[PDB]
Design an enzyme around this catalytic site. Sequence first.
Site, short mmCIF file in Angstrom:
data_model
loop_
_atom_site.label_atom_id
_atom_site.label_comp_id
_atom_site.label_asym_id
_atom_site.label_seq_id
_atom_site.Cartn_x
_atom_site.Cartn_y
_atom_site.Cartn_z
N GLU D 481 8.03 6.82 1.25
CA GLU D 481 9.24 6.95 0.42
C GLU D 481 9.77 8.39 0.40
O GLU D 481 9.92 9.01 -0.65
CB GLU D 481 9.01 6.38 -0.99
CG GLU D 481 8.75 4.87 -1.01
CD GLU D 481 8.37 4.33 -2.38
OE1 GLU D 481 7.46 4.90 -3.04
OE2 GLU D 481 8.97 3.31 -2.79
N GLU D 550 3.47 -2.68 1.33
CA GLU D 550 3.21 -2.95 -0.08
C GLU D 550 3.86 -4.29 -0.45
O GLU D 550 5.03 -4.52 -0.15
CB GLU D 550 3.79 -1.85 -0.96
CG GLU D 550 3.26 -0.46 -0.70
CD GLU D 550 4.01 0.62 -1.45
OE1 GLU D 550 4.64 0.32 -2.50
OE2 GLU D 550 3.98 1.79 -0.99
#
EC number: 3.2.1.23
Lengths: 121, 129, 129, 1024, 129
Positions: D481, D550
């Site tokens: 991220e 994820e």
Amino acid sequence: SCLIPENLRNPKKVHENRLPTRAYYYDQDIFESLNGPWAFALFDAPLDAPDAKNLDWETAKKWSTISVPSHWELQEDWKYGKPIYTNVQYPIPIDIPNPPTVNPTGVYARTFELDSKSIES
Amino acid sequence: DLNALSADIFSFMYPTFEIMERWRKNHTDENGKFEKPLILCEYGHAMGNGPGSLKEYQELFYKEKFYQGGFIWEWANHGIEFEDVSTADGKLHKAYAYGGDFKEEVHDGVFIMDGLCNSEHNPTPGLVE
Amino acid sequence: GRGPGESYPDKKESQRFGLYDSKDVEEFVYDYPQENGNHTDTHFLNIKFEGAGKLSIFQKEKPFNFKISDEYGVDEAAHACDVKRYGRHYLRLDHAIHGVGSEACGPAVLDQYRLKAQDFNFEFDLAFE
Amino acid sequence: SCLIPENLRNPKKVHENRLPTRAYYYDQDIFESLNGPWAFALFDAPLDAPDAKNLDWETAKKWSTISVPSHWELQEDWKYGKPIYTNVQYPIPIDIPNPPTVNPTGVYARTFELDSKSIESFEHRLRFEGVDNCYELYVNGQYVGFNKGSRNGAEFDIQKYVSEGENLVVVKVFKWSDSTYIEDQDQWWLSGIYRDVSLLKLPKKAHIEDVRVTTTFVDSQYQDAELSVKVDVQGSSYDHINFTLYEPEDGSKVYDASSLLNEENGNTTFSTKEFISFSTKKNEETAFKINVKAPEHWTAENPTLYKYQLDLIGSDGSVIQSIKHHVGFRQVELKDGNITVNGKDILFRGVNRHDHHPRFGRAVPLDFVVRDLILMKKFNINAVRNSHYPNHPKVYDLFDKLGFWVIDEADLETHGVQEPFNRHTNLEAEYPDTKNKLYDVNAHYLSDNPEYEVAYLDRASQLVLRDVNHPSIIIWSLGNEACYGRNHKAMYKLIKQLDPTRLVHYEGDLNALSADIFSFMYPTFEIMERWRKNHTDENGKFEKPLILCEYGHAMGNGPGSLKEYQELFYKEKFYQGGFIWEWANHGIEFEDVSTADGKLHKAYAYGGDFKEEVHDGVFIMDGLCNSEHNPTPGLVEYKKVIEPVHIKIAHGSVTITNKHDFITTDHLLFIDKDTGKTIDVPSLKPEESVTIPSDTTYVVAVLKDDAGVLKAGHEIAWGQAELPLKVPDFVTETAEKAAKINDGKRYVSVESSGLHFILDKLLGKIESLKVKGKEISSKFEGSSITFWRPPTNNDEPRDFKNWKKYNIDLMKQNIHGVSVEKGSNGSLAVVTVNSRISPVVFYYGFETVQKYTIFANKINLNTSMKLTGEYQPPDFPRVGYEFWLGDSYESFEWLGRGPGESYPDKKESQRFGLYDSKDVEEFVYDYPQENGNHTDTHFLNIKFEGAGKLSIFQKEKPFNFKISDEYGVDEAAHACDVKRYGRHYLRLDHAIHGVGSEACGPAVLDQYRLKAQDFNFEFDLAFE
Amino acid sequence: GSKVYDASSLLNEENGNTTFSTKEFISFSTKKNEETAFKINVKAPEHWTAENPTLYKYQLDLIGSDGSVIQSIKHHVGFRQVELKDGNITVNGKDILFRGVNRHDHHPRFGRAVPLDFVVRDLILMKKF
Ligand SMILES: [Mn+3]
Ligand SMILES: [Mn+3]
């Protein structure tokens, strides 16, 4: 008593071939740990245990393992029994010097590697 | 070896003050000399709520050169961790086992739990006192 | 009074005097459930009620004993998890309490700490803010 | 900015004088631990810290000590501050590249002894395994160097600086720097020397600096392989190198914590079962390529390793230095659009694992890491993602030996750049297919910022070069991220140059312009499917596959619908599995003041507990395991949905399908649970299946022998035939008994032999129901039928908002009429209650009819609930009765799912059977919420002391139930804040809302939602 | 004896190439073919006491013909003498007081197979109390 091995009922058989006691010093270069998983089997009494003079690693390989060090009454799911608490009282009958005939016998086995130089050095 | 025929020290366990004092007096000569001292290899049994009167033992220790202190019994409860069925809940909970919990033919029950620290080796009010 | 932990006639001196708040104290859980949580030599006790201030409690001319808890079935609970709990708290407000000793293995509670059978006379005030 | 030191605000000052990264090997003869107590002092900012060029040991001796390794926010009595939890948001102002001026600075100091012979015999280095955030290093009052990269290692040459006798090491550690901007992982902010410190003594005239080991199969049939060993030797005084490869030890090898962690030793003979030997010649390249005949493959399912010994040899033929490590014969490729290991397109059964310990934080004892991995293996996990940084270097041998597919990930997260943007634009949601356009807006700050290229490359170089030789690692990840920019492209080029043997992952790169793999987090099935279809051409070919780095957010009660994700994984070759987030709750142990008690209790902290200015609350608690790293119902469920063998029982047949990637079913014992006798199952290859005729209901797949870290008898997979709902054979007493019916003004009594029924007609409340010594009564607050549940973490963002908005917690029963008639067909009496069940404020509600048909030993309760009125909720949490249980109550027993809790979309791991409450430790959530429900319940027996049982069953459908003690669950912050009644209650439910994963991911799926509708259900209360 | 320790430094077992110490105080060598023993006079050494556990580290080397080290022992000396003197247990002439406990080997999960880490925990706690 031929159903109880001689060495488990001889107060004078304190050891056989044990080296004389010496002052303890841990030395990393001398001490090599053999702790970890060992092949292990539990038997009702000495007479059910195999003759160790004839036990292959090829045979012992097939057993479950137990981790050294540990008590066998303190395993996952109480696999080899549970702890017993007594304060004063003996948990066996008193017949000095005999132990009980039914006498839990645990056989441990593992291997280790040795070099050509090692045996010489 | 009560009379220390083959020891260099006298030793009592869990003695009463009166008993300590009898011994002291019977082993101190008229001059005030003693040949061997007294320790309490076990005293102030630390089982559960207690021990009481550690104070009074200590006062005695400081008062007489003949007494050289003691070792309380014991450091920690011998509890073994296990899964217990709750009498309050009807459900399964982590607990610490003493005699009987592992269903021995013969056992000595809760005398396992006789430490200044609990089974997890953490201080009780005994250790704090 | 005495704190932060519990205290009993013959097991109290480690618990110095001061002002104590129940919120600052992790109350001790015995491995074997038994008498616990008493506070001896209590000068005064403030019980806080949400949105209504405090109730102050004091015994006349002598310090008192108290326990505030949740619990019952303590006599017969084998382990901490076997202890039962009410849907509300109680105050155990005591004029006197027996000592603790070490009789499980050792001397009985000493004379000066025994709650001897006798007349009892005591005065309490329940003061509401 | 002269009030901030230059090196803490220079993105290019990645280090000063750090040695080049090399492959990590622990050697007891070389490594000397400097762990233990160090002199330590903390300062407000750099300018308050002493000049280390003038710091005596005589001065530092006088400071307090801290123990290395540890975080300074995790000390006795919070001496040096408390942990800070932020998820996305930076805990500092954003002024790239400046850190805050007030910047906690910790100075460490200790000494070590050096011999006369030592300085002559050895090259001396200091190796730091991890320091957060960055540090400068001093020896004997002389500057050695500087380092950034908290989860990376660092070695410094110390030879110039050392003296005979006492030597002084001083480390200046800083909390913040320009580096902070790229270290914004969703975790605790913690500082200090949190990993090992060592003094290295390398042989002086010549030593082994680096080793590269690769295994490439020569052939498309993956038989013969080329073993390539390249060595970098530093110095002149050596002759050649020797190399010995030993006979393989099969991956079924038995390990425990002790043998996995054994670090010995010098005189220890590594192995003697020689297989291949090679010697180099004097003055020739210290490298070679060997052909190896059909070696045993290394696989995560079977981590077979060949031990090897590499020897550096002098002129006199003596051994200068040895490396004892292992080779795993494995090749990873991108092949026909799939991640391929030894030609096989693998499936990831994975988790993300952070470094976390509830007391030590990121300073995790290896013992504890081993604990983690054994547990993972015990629960069918085959892969781990190092979220979001490399771990302690010793951990990778653990992966190698136990067998995990590993994604080793760069220490680089930039997430916080988005937070001001999110708030300014009032962004509600991000979606895997479109969110990249949002991150593109801010990429210029860091990931597309040229000033940070050196830093970004350093994170890559450090990642790869330390861990290159571990067969378990198959994928390098560029971080997490961090948006997408030129720096990522640069990292990709470098990694492929450094290590061509592995694949590169980076989720921030949607189109994988500089990655070899596609990756989503928390995607919807529709989103997965859109992507699949848009990347599969008309021929059915795809260029790259999809993983879920994820998914199935494990926060609290949940995750729901792991099942539906798995079905998708198995159906399409394009999907290759996923890694659930996360392995364990990040809870820190602390003393909590109880809301229930007014007293102090041990608890596990999340955001807010340490009183941060800014924090992200309970998002700390998002693991399959709790803070103490023990399994939750989440882990239990995951183990079942990912089981590598399918067992289906239908129509007198057991179908067994092997779902492993590589291994056979031979290691498994199949037991017919109905008989106890074993079933002869043919050896099944991956994807092979067999149908065996059988009358069995329940088949278990179990381990034959101790293998790896698993024990004989350990359950790998299981199956059951579906169980029809059978009405118990309870005999209702329909004989005619005289019964007194007293219909008063407010209360109605029905009395008979052994029976007492009292109802409050005003409330619709059962005052008391006592039958044959067994008593219940309604747990009444407003209504006899209730709908609320303490919201789960997943409920919070949306469903809870709706349920609160529609006042579902304030549902009221308003009685309209009560009808009392004498018994008919064996009946004693019939009491019928007409009411409206509706909340205050609202129109919507249920026209309700409750018909109580009373028999001598049984009570039939028919409930009819007609949904009426405008402005209704979409769904309810729950619907059913609440009953107080009598003082007699001791335990319960049920036929249905167990032993643990179960919910509509989280139930399949809980097999059918007869369960006893006494056999079950009911699960305590770190964050109190809805728990303890049992779904698909056939019947429930409630045992009362001295009076037998009350049997409860719903007509024609299985039901839901919870028996507990507890309340104040909604507002209890921690387990110790939960309040408890002086008696138990039964929550008896017709239906319950699913659980989902909406805290981060999809809402409860449609088929699991408790939609607003009419309710009609019949219960029997049968008294023994 | 005021030396600072923690679990890590107490349990550190290293190592071969590790230089034990270099702050030499006394050195002695034996001669070829002579008794491998000796007696040394030591000027006013620091006393070892339980209240102040001062230690002198030492290194004992076995040496071959070529003058190389065959084996080393690295341990410590505590300068202390215990006697029975005028009826008291005496250390360095002082009649000491035992502030003691009995400690069994026990761990709540491992039993008598106690990790050294856990023993250290015990002793730190003892010292803290
Ligand atoms: Mn119990
Ligand atoms: Mn709380």
